Design goal:
The structure is a homohexamer. In chain A, strand 8 and strand 9 form a beta hairpin. The first copy, chain A, has 239 residues and is an alpha+beta fold. Helices cover 30% and strands 28% of the residues of chain A. The radius of gyration of chain A is 18 Å and the shape is globular. In chain A, helix 2 packs across helix 3 and helix 3 packs parallel to helix 5. Chain A has one domain: Ribosomal Protein S5, domain 2 (2-Layer Sandwich). Chain A has a five-stranded mixed β-sheet. Chain A has five helices and nine strands. Chains in contact: A-B, A-D, B-C, C-F, D-E, E-F. Chains A and B meet through strand 3, helix 1 and strand 5 of A and strand 3, helix 1 and strand 5 of B. Chain E: One of its GO terms (molecular function) is RNA binding. Chain E: InterPro entries: ExoRNase_PH_dom1 (IPR001247), ExoRNase_PH_dom2 (IPR015847), ExoRNase_PH_dom2_sf (IPR036345), PNPase/RNase_PH_dom_sf (IPR027408), Ribosomal_Su5_D2-typ_SF (IPR020568), RNase_PH (IPR050080), RNase_PH_bac-type (IPR002381), RNase_PH_CS (IPR018336).
Chain lengths: 239, 240, 240, 243, 241, 239
């Protein structure tokens, strides 16, 4: 067994809390084990066909050692930009921006604690926030079509650690992985993206297929967790 | 007769203090003043630029009623951010013996998850508890030059004149109509630390100041008790 | 009994106010608090971004005893700068009826030519005189909805506990020793705008606060007089 | 052949590799994928910014006039675009996968990829060209006797864009094809039959796993041509005067 | 003889290649010996804040210098040298163009140094003019010109200074660093001056020296103007509108 | 005819006020007509052979219409950097940095009011400040050479306005000059730089002769003004 007592194919405990804050149309605190990310979906009137932007960031204290605030430093880190763009791509893949009307949805993912898999947790939670924002826009009757979402989005890290394929890697496993990867998938039997291979690793087709098989199994578990959380009543006051 | 949320003029919104909200920081405190939520962390490092303490305040884009642009993306800190950041630094350093801490550095981070008025005062109140936990952590690791670095407790609350009445801890609703606004920082040893941030366009008589101070200082006593209650619990994590 | 510059605890440094120091701005005021020299200007423009006023404070690199780095060259505004800039803007707006001004904008610039303590209080005191000249200018150009946009006068002074004594208008040396010190922003009507904390962070008794306010408000009276004397002269324009 | 430039779906644009385009850097390669043009240089430095292993960094930029309509300089805006940082990081990650930094010794190689003309596939061209520049930088260091081992390079790196355009799977997409593709991505591979990365590009889309397999098939088939083009160019004499 | 193999009045081999890239209306790779600069002219309709306008920007690729230099976009700011040279280029090119005759169109000039071995800004100006000409040719063929001949003269520039007690033109990096005094001279094919600038660090000069420097510089520009005409005599290498 | 009643070859009234502020070693308020520039020279304990650096900036209200503060914009204008570099290069031409101590002299030129010829005023004033800074340093025994200054620096603007050559152009003339430039010279019969200004224009060789003749005549007057002001005692003293 792993360090956290998990089996190789097991996700960490996933906790999805809708309406963690009240101002955003969507506000979801998602936890993959000790990894905690607050994902919000803010709605505005007027695009700059609707639009969806995505921004990812980590609180200075989220990491084991405190990192400098990017605002203080005066610039975004490369990693930040990389992840933000991944999230933006991932979410747009399952939303019909024409059915959204000329609206703008700003996705914000702020990591409160980082113990590996922060970008995949962020994507998984961001989708729930997006669902709530859409529910909100629907109530306020601002959607060109009642169902802009064509599929659900989830994501999970996967890699070879200690000679074995494992899913949802915490910090310690990730730093030890001979090959690692982030998989974004839909509940409608399709892929959205495979992202961010670990530094210095090259993989064979067979290895890719096995990594995908693992990740897709785990994603199914994520879709269910999302469905369970979304089955509850909207945590706020509908327009 | 009563405020929009049913409160009396002297009553604080419900106060919730959760220590060990995250594991990595030596101190991690989620504090809530009603709907206002601020994550307050205290990170510990060795060396300095006596020890030092620095503080940074920030608001998540979605914390406000309408999303605000991320400062890192905009490429600069807003004036509000530097004002409040410096306030927190001054306030906290007021009750620490940096000479009795070692050549260590405590970085205070206050990140607003939801803004509903009084974020900077909640931030200060929560930051003190985080600091206290950072001091406990340092103590266990045998890093202190003196066993008791903290010389007093810090707390803070907003006060103002809304509807011609002197009220404490203003939400956004009240704070937007306040005839006069401000933030008071005080110690649990009867002393003051700072009075700050008068509402836009607001002026106030000397006599009004004294009533505002009376009220604020009353609420702070409630805050110090809440802090003590929270700090009574065991350290919420693994200790060196 | 006597301070380094031969002053009593309650005495202000010699105050000099020179209007029309430059000709381009509607208001151009060189104010001096002893050795502290601040050029305060008021620029008038078309419309807002009810009129609006903004304020910006900055120190010339050579103003400080040891040359400080130019902010433009550094690539960022210091926190102290934004903090003071905001205070100046708010203070002035507290004694203007923007409606009486009509859609219009007054840009306040306070640039320190020489810093010897109390640069921000000098900047506020001088800025008001520049603002008055800006109003005078706008009136002559017949761009004012109301002839009397100014509802009161604004001045400010530093005060603190130095060498165990309550003292007003602290120079650089006294400021660095100050056990406690602050900037009091007052109106000539009899109200307060702000009491800005400044140090690294300190605690003071409420009775001490009352003393500090008492002396500070007295010194401001002297400042309001200096403002009137200067403003009693003819507009150094450049009349429209 | 229903492609704007006359190509079949599986065909690469004409590839031109010119080594020693400039003479100051240890490696300097102008690479062309049809009308796309990228200058890929490799500058060598003594030491590293601590264990005993060298380092390789990568930066990618587009000249203002490279795009169809002039774009503003990032230096003038005072900010790096997310696109720039994204590509810069991928290039460095891709090249490091085939270089033994220990066997390299404590030397640092700086890869710079500047787009002179942009007509799609600029980051895949950048990667493909950067490897040749890297190889030349290694030849330089080898001759100067600054290597802990004579052969730090364990494989060759190339990349090509692939996607679904006009309902067909196509490789090496120009500007116009890329801007209308249902699905598109950049495949980075080695010449040892392994994958380095599959970089998603564009607005965002979903694709069946069977489609991915087809995309990889054609992309990897195109990379073989790229690997041969790199070989043929490197078979020429070193354009500079090895120490 | 110089370490170059050149005489004191000799320019390094000059190469001008029009249509190096296809996207810009004008695109010229110019080489003063080992110095290589890509000079582009991008046509835009309309005007900034405004007669038409011309802007100029100069930059060096990190590897252009002997030791790789930091990318300005990564630094987070332009260097003073960059803005100094960018402005010099803008003034120089606008001096020989009638922006009225150009209509309300904007020409953006970009000079990116691929390899630096002295005289990069002068090479940039010389190559930029050729690109400007091609841009004017483009606009004409499109018809978006108020007057068929907005160019009133040809612009060229060269470096010159006193090295080892002798006056020389087109200084490489080598001589550039040993120069008692050196500067950049921009001139027209009419024989008039456009600008003299960038005196070497810590150097002063008598008017008699300045006159010697200018005479030398003007001679060299004659050669440059010939090179420009030769290159511009070839057909437009792009695909006219 | 010229607006202010000046002939073509004469300067606006020049006023030089040393010790305008006390903190810096050299502090000079110089005025060319209505142009006012505060030129200071600050000393330091080292360098980056001594060193001299210069910075020029304009107060927002210095111009007819307020200009944006550069620190607020977040970047230096090209004009600012162009002039800063010119000023530092000019002053360095007449000082033996080796003769100077192992110290730096930071030159700051801040324009209080701009009515044309700010940069030539800045240079002309900056030298006087530099002089006082040298006086200060030698009086502190922190100089290696009793006389680091090998010459005096002064500058004036010259151009063609209304078809005729004129010296020291105010704003109204500068904004309509066909040809325009700034001449930096020494008091020892040499030149330092001829900085082109304006939008850009050509001028004949013989025109350059006329421009320099008139400009160099004006500079002599400036050299006089500098001498007279430096003839007065140093305000402050240092044993």
């Amino acid at each position: 067994k792993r360090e956290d007592g998990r089996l190789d194919h097991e996700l960490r405990p996933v906790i999805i809390t809708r309406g963690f804050t009240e101002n955003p149309a969507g506000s979801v605190l998602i936890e993959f084990g000790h990894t905690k990310v607050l994902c919000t979906a803010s709605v505005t009137e007027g695009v700059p066909l609707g639009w969806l932007t995505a921004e990812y960031a980590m609180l200075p204290s989220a990491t084991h050692s405190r990192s400098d605030r990017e605002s203080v430093r005066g610039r975004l880190s490369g990693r930040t930009q990389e992840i933000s763009r991944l999230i933006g791509r991932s979410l747009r893949a399952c939303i019909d921006l024409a059915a959204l009307g000329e609206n703008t949805i700003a996705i914000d993912c702020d990591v409160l604690q980082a113990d590996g898999g922060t970008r995949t947790a962020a994507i998984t939670g961001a989708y729930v926030a997006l669902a709530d924002a859409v529910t909100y826009l629907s109530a306020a009757g601002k959607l060109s079509d009642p169902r802009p979402l064509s599929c659900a989005i989830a994501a999970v890290s996967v890699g070879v650690v200690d000679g074995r394929i494992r899913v949802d890697l915490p910090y310690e496993e990730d730093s030890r992985a001979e090959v690692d990867m982030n998989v974004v998938a839909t509940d409608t039997g399709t892929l959205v993206e495979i992202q961010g291979t670990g530094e210095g690793a090259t993989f064979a087709r067979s290895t890719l297929d096995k990594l995908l098989d693992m990740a897709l199994g785990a994603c199914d578990t994520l879709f269910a967790a999302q469905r369970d959380a979304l089955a509850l009543p909207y945590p706020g006051v509908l327009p």
